[PDB]
Amino acid sequence: VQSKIGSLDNITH
Amino acid sequence: VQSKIGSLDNITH
Amino acid sequence: VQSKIGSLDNITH
Amino acid sequence: VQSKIGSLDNITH
Amino acid sequence: VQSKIGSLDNITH
Amino acid sequence: VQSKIGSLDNITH
Amino acid sequence: VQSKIGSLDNITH
Amino acid sequence: VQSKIGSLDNITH
Amino acid sequence: VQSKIGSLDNITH
Amino acid sequence: VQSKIGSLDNITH
Amino acid sequence: VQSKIGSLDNITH
Amino acid sequence: VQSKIGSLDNITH
Amino acid sequence: VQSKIGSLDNITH
Amino acid sequence: VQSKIGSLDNITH
Amino acid sequence: VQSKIGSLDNITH
Amino acid sequence: VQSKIGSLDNITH
Amino acid sequence: VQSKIGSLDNITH
Amino acid sequence: VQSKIGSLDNITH
Amino acid sequence: VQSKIGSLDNITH
Amino acid sequence: VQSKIGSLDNITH
Amino acid sequence: VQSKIGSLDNITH
Amino acid sequence: VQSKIGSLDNITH
Amino acid sequence: VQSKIGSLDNITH
Amino acid sequence: VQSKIGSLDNITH
Amino acid sequence: VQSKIGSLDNITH
Amino acid sequence: VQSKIGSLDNITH
Amino acid sequence: VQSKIGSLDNITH
Amino acid sequence: VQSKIGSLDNITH
Amino acid sequence: VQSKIGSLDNITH
Amino acid sequence: VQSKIGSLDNITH
Amino acid sequence: VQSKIGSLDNITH
Amino acid sequence: VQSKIGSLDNITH
Amino acid sequence: VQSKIGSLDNITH
Amino acid sequence: VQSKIGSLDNITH
Amino acid sequence: VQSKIGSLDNITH
Amino acid sequence: VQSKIGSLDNITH
């Protein structure tokens, strides 16, 4: 597996 | 698997 | 699998 | 639940 | 649920 | 739960 | 106001 | 105001 | 005000 | 606003 | 705002 | 605001 | 038993 | 039993 | 038993 | 009131 | 009132 | 009041 | 309110 | 209110 | 309020 | 058995 | 048995 | 047995 | 969730 | 959920 | 959760 | 048994 | 048994 | 048994 | 991305 | 990215 | 990234 | 195999 | 194998 | 094997 992610936001308000 | 993702938002308001 | 995604929004208001 | 209220008056007279 | 209310008056007189 | 209230008056007279 | 009232309920949910 | 009241409830949830 | 009241409840949750 | 939700799932695979 | 939620899941795999 | 939540999970794998 | 009474008058004149 | 009464008058004149 | 009474008057004149 | 009564019963169950 | 009564019964069940 | 009564019963259960 | 109940079962299996 | 109930079962399996 | 209850079971298995 | 329940209420009034 | 419950209420009023 | 419960209330009023 | 199992065999050979 | 199973075999060979 | 199991075998061979 | 296997999963929920 | 296996999982929930 | 195994997991929850 | 591959062979002879 | 691969062989002979 | 691989062979002969 | 090749490319994306 | 090759590339992404 | 190679690359990402 080769992965590239810029930004990751997992948010609960 | 080769993946490229710019931005990922998983949000609950 | 070769994937390219610009922006991903998974949002619940 | 996402909520927005400007003004709220619960008044007994 | 996404809600927007300007003004709310619950008045007994 | 994300909430925003400007003003709230719970008044008995 | 100048009344005879058994039960008075002024409620906001 | 100038009344005869058994029970008075002014409630905001 | 100038009343006869059995029970008075002014509650904010 | 008066809201009741049994179950909520906001999921990204 | 009066809210009741049984269960909530905001998950990214 | 009056809120009741049974369970909450904000998880990133 | 779940009961709610506003006013009760048991009066003999 | 689930009961709600506004006013009750049991009066003998 | 769950009971709520505003006012009670048991009066003999 | 100004009467002749053998038995007087004013009962609320 | 100004009467002759043998038995008086005023009952609320 | 100004009467002749054998038994007077004013009861609230 | 006058109530008479023989047996009451509120059960979750 | 006059009530008479033999048996009451409120059950969830 | 007049109440009479034989047996009360509030059970969670 | 694989079970998922959001909310459960077993209530007697 | 594999079980998941958000919220549970077994209540008698 | 594998069990997960968010909240539990066994209440008698 | 109410469950009853007589026997269970999860076997790899 | 009320369930009854006599026998269960999950076997890989 | 109410559960009853007679026998359980999780065996790797 | 006498095999070439990449991944083996024998699962019971 | 007499095999070549990368990953073996025998799981009961 | 007489095998070459990378990871072996025999788990009961 | 949610992916599942049984077997992959990238072979140059 | 959520990925599952059984077997991978990148072989040059 | 969530990844699961059974077996990996990067071999040069 | 027994050949004359300038460039060899065996790629899996 | 028994060849004359300038460049050999065996790549898995 | 028994060859003449300028560059050999066997890569797993």
Numbering used by the authors:
A (entry chain J), B (entry chain V), C (entry chain h), D (entry chain W), E (entry chain i), F (entry chain K), ...: 350 to 362
What is the paper's account of this structure, in its own sentences?
Specifically, we were able to identify 2D-classes containing potential two (65%), three (28%) and four (10%) protofilament polymorphs assembled from conserved core folds. Each protofilament contained six PAM4 subunits, giving a total of twelve subunits per layer of the fibril with each protofilament comprising a head-to-tail ring of PAM4 peptides. The lower abundance, larger fibril morphologies of the PAM4 peptide fibrils could not be resolved to high resolution but appeared to contain the same protofilament building blocks as PAM4 Type 1 with increasing assembly sizes. All four of the PAM4 fibril structures are inferred to be left-handed from the resolution of the cryoEM maps, as well as from cryo-electron tomography (cryoET) reconstructions of Type 1 fibrils. Interestingly, the folds were interchangeable within the different fibril types, with Type 1 contaning FoldA and B, Type 2 fibrils containing FoldB, C and D, and Type 3 and Type 4 fibrils containing FoldC and D. In the FoldA-FoldB building block (seen in PAM4 Type 1 fibrils), the FoldA subunits are similar to FoldB but bend further around the GS region to cap the end of the adjacent peptide chain. FoldB PAM4, which has a flipped N-terminal compared to the previous fold, perfectly matches the 4R PSP-derived tau fibril cores and shows a C-terminal mismatch to the 3R PiD tau polymorph.
Here, we identify a new amyloidogenic segment, PAM4 (Polymorphic AMyloid segment in repeat 4), encompassing residues 350–362 of R4, and show that it self-assembles into amyloid fibrils.
